[PDB]
Symmetry: D2
């Protein structure tokens, strides 16, 4: 139900081997680790969770943009990109969190489908 | 070798049934029709051309954003979105022209891969 | 030294009355409240801090996009937009944090100048 | 009534010395040259036209992004960014055409105000 896709606006390519961490907000308002991985050669990270586990709640997707740029020998602005949203059962069932990265800028969009 | 993908930033969905026209720049500097179609339920338009036909040159991808918004009952700013680029044989072989649409704004990125 | 500007991609206008909260990473790694305000009729928020107070650190600029959208009758996707960055680590700079908002998408850019 | 502002997403700065050509659709459906200029050190281009001259029409703002990038040693993807819109068809408005540039990506937003 959750996929993350990352693109590099400088090179016009997927952003490969980017670390991504997902957290779920706990009842005490802290962020608890939920799932993680590294984007593939296609810039995608699949397999993070299951329908059973991805219950309604507030989630945060943290994308390690700084390490990505540093590996390319480029100084970037942000520490990371963070995407924070509520998962809602009464909306479509599949969430794609997309991010488009530049050194001093990023875009993120949610594509929510059935 | 050429795919076009269009997303709707207002609804968080693919932009479906969007008309797309591709032109190739002729020797006399006019734009000649090259290929066209409508985006699918996934917001994608595949099958526009072939490797044989997609020779080096300057191409323009025109996305009929205004009709898309009007069909949703929303007044938009732009007449269309236009993406103009040179196809280069010494780069990767597959070009994805992506567009992210809002009523008063759009983003476009090229993802060029092997 | 720190300004925030927010635009609305739906209406083609400044995003007015957007709440913004700034935090700074403390020595204990918690996010300490640093400054807050709301965007004006121009979509800008000025006067958050001073060059004396805006020391080196890791800052988080939280833009309350959900609270903004709900008021135009849009149930938007994100809770807020968070912009996290190291500031002033090569000496004082001026930072503009710009954000462009749509209900299911946003972008943010930093413009950094050396006075 | 017509301003263009351009930012560079790579450097986190205004995009300076960017050429901009504006055209207007003529009665014969050709693109007639309307105004041109270059962005300043602030990334802004002011003074393109006057409210008298900026009549209703379909306008195209061509931003010469390739010419810009080639100079920072980036071979970029696009030839230019084209922004095409109907203006002033409900009476005079003020238009800001903003663009955010990366070598393989750009975004553009319009801010439209009624004086
Ligand atoms: C935030 C943003 C900006 C742009 C120009 C494109 C996209 C985008 N999001 C995508 C999700 C799936 C496949 C292709 C996609 O392209 C996302
Ligand atoms: C992150 C972003 C993306 C785009 C296409 C535009 C802006 C933007 N933010 C602006 C604030 C004041 C004047 C012009 C502005 O343009 C900010």
């Amino acid at each position: 139900p959750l996929m993350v896709k990352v693109l590099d606006a400088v090179r016009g390519s997927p952003a490969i081997n980017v670390a991504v961490h997902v957290f779920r907000k706990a009842a005490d308002d802290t962020w608890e680790p939920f799932a993680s991985g590294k984007t593939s050669e296609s810039g995608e990270l699949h397999g993070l969770t299951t329908e059973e586990e991805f219950v309604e709640g507030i989630y945060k997707v943290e994308i390690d943009t700084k390490s990505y740029w540093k590996a390319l020998g480029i100084s970037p602005f942000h520490e990371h990109a963070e995407v924070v949203f509520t998962a809602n059962d009464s909306g479509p069932r599949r969430y794609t969190i997309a991010a488009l990265l530049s050194p001093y800028s990023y875009s993120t969009t949610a594509v929510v489908t059935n």
